[PDB]
């Protein structure tokens, strides 16, 4: 009710919220897939399927090839930028094709995202790595998995929770929290 933007930017913002809503813990989710190096699954997630129609159909294939490539490089090596992954996963739905990449990934509404440089459509900063600015709308990212910039003890705190005491489980260091398995 307290909004003046049109259905297009609202739809894109909602899609990015939904994509960030699958960043939570548990199997069949983005962090676990990244740990299992199963980048292929990311291309068939429900939220990318829902967001695919927006993508500019004339050159959907070319963009899909570039973004489908970058993720692998990020995924395989182990050095990745979570924000870039979220930014470019909507394009990984369609079959790759051949073509020249100018530099910007358009939607069907004349709004683009350039892979690496912050712009109005999608912004963020290394200082506050827990905010995504989509058309001047703040989307909180949960703190379930660290990133190269944001990496610290805090970026995982939300993922953990307390449970019934079990004395069999091991006693670990605070730093080793990063390495524990989901649902362990």
């Amino acid at each position: 009710d307290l909004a003046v933007l049109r259905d297009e930017k609202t739809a894109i913002t909602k899609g990015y919220e939904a994509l960030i809503k699958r960043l939570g813990t548990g199997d069949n989710d983005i962090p676990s897939l990244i740990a299992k190096k199963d980048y292929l699954s990311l291309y068939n997630l429900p939220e990318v399927k829902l967001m695919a129609p927006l993508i500019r159909p004339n050159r959907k294939g070319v963009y899909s090839r570039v973004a489908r490539k970058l993720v692998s490089t990020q995924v395989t090596t182990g050095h990745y930028s979570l924000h870039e992954l979220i930014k470019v996963l909507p394009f990984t739905y369609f079959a790759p094709k051949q073509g020249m990449f100018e530099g910007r990934l358009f939607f069907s509404n004349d709004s683009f995202v350039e892979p690496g440089v912050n712009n109005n459509v999608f912004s963020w900063s290394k200082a506050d790595s827990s905010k995504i600015y989509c058309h001047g709308i703040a989307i909180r990212v949960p703190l379930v998995v660290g990133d190269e910039h944001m990496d610290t003890s805090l970026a995982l705190l939300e993922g953990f929770s307390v449970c019934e005491n079990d004395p069999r489980a091991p006693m670990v260091t605070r730093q080793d929290l990063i390495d524990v398995g989901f649902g362990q």
């Binding site: 020249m100 990449f101 100018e102 530099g103 350039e114 690496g116 440089v117």
Partner: peptide, 8 residues
């Protein structure tokens, strides 16, 4: 080459 790139 054939394309214009950017560097921060």
């Amino acid at each position: 080459g054939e394309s214009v790139i950017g560097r921060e």
